[PDB]
Homo-oligomer: 199 residues x 4
């Protein structure tokens, strides 16, 4: 199929001052681009191995596939979760679900911040939808392990806590980044993803 790097839905500087333009440009044009390129190389090798019945080769390719495939999945969602027009609080049924499942919007922010701050090493914090239980759920994922492929939860909002997501601007202080990012959450997109889950 040949995966492609999706265009960013805004200018690299559109999320300033919360995420600076240098980070956005590196994150999209270098990090995400590399995931796409390496995913395409890995998928081609997997097709060769499947055609030959080389199970050893398939298994040896799994780390690169999950890492670059997961990186592509996660970053593709991440870009749509952010917006220069973002921030504030969601409305409608998503806000109702947040209050129901987490108590309040403020308590939800505390819980998702805590999950994202708690990642040791590289990883992601997620607000997801549990289809079987029919409610929201917070989870963390290591490295580039993607939410749906590894947990079954449908991703609604992801917070990248790899050092490349914040280090140039916030250095070691991940909590300052986690506080800033709330100003650019695209609740319109998160709402669209949530509504798609229900019926």
């Amino acid at each position: 199929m040949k995966h492609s790097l999706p265009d960013l839905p805004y200018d690299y500087g559109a999320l300033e001052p919360h995420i600076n333009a240098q980070i956005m440009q590196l994150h999209h044009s270098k990090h995400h681009a590399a995931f796409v390129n390496n995913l395409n190389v890995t998928e081609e090798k997997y097709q060769e191995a499947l055609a030959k019945g080389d199970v050893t080769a398939q298994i040896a390719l799994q780390p690169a596939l999950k890492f670059n495939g997961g990186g592509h999945i996660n970053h593709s969602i991440f870009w749509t979760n952010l917006s220069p027009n973002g921030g504030g609080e969601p409305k409608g049924e998503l806000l109702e679900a947040i209050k129901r499942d987490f108590g309040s919007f403020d308590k939800f922010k505390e819980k998702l911040t805590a999950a994202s701050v708690g990642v040791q090493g590289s990883g992601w914090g997620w607000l997801g939808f549990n289809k079987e239980r029919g409610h929201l759920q917070i989870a963390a994922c290591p490295n580039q392990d993607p939410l749906q492929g590894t947990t079954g939860l449908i991703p609604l909002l992801g917070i990248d806590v790899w050092e490349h997501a914040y280090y140039l601007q916030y250095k070691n202080v991940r909590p300052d980044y986690l506080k800033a990012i709330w100003n650019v959450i695209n609740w319109e997109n998160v709402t669209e993803r949530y509504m798609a889950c229900k019926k």
Copy 2:
């Protein structure tokens, strides 16, 4: 391409009294048969996901692929590593490599037994060949993780320490099984695998 269950190269009772016939029949005709069938099912699902560029589906299939594919890889080697004509010590260049890399055959036996006894949960102990270093090497693998796909070492001799490999006969006493298995190691096969590495 479709993987197939290899026939056992000897009678189910050929390894008695070291591994009883009930274990051999269950291990081959039930456990390995399930791995092969589930591998073919997983590979077909992966081919579909690859054709659609569904990376989430590919990643969700990785555990089943490594588990069932590794199960097929490991057990296919295992049956050839055992023989009613086995036991004793290897000869020729394999024996020389064992003495060179481990000090003696007895010291090698201690190291492979220790790796196999040390597995917590299900897994395998392996004598492998390190192609880059050009020498033998011992490693342990969890569950059905196969040696070459996860470490790059070429498998020479594998010891299955899943409970289904010994429990009916030896119950919880894994060391009794490890002591018995040395009497049925097919050093002719281990030598063939070793000589193929040095080509």
Copy 3:
């Protein structure tokens, strides 16, 4: 402080025909006994390493501590989760929570069975209580990884799917064991653990 092997609260043959006496005696008097003894050995080594500030030694002991400590935690709960007086359905608030969180008791049984059947290698299926969300939750754990220590969920009902839990009687057919075990679930104990959570 020294951990001790709890006596089984019933006869080794009390769960027949669902779990035979040979399994119960081996499972308790051999498998659990080894976990307790190895836990005490590991804890003593950890106390020495902590006193010396030997972080390398502490980290090297982590696998044995989680394996044997988890083994002790899990099996101590497991014996109380089973009873000759078991089977049937729970009553009162636990039944209400099951219907509320899973739809029905039968749907809950399907979800916990699926989690337990889905374990690849050794592990456990759990019904737990999520304190932060205030509701029930199903999770699976690998090897002897204990539920609360690794997920934060409070354990209510655990299903051991290590091969030593069923192999002598059910051989490779784990689903037959899972079908049988429902006849001996001690819902009185599961209810007590649940009520302690809502205090």
Copy 4:
């Protein structure tokens, strides 16, 4: 015992232009300092749990202990592995061992670079000594998992490939960092660590 942040054996700018002073200052005074502080907090909680026989609490503390304890172990070695007076090639028996085990010094550099470049996510590349085999060995470790505590190999030379080790200067281009770091390897320290392994 109360672990302490070791003084750096040189000025924060002593490794320029290969690793800039801002990185060295953040890496030591923020990242390593945090590992030490969090290690001390975690060890105190572990002492409490050991005194109470709370195995659940001990296991829940394992991730923080390995992460911060491993971070302390790894960075303490890393600082001594570098020097403004470094670079070039080792001499004496260490050089003899490198030629013997890897073919040449240049081939060793290629192998350690490849292991360090190959880390997906956060981690480390290591040249270690295998006491049982009596020879050098290259390995990679994820996150802050320390070499000796998780593999048994004695650390000789470590290459930190966490993004915070290079990102401010080299951005996403880890290979440029891996090339530059060879100019500051303190082969006198690596030789001391190697000689300590033999007899």
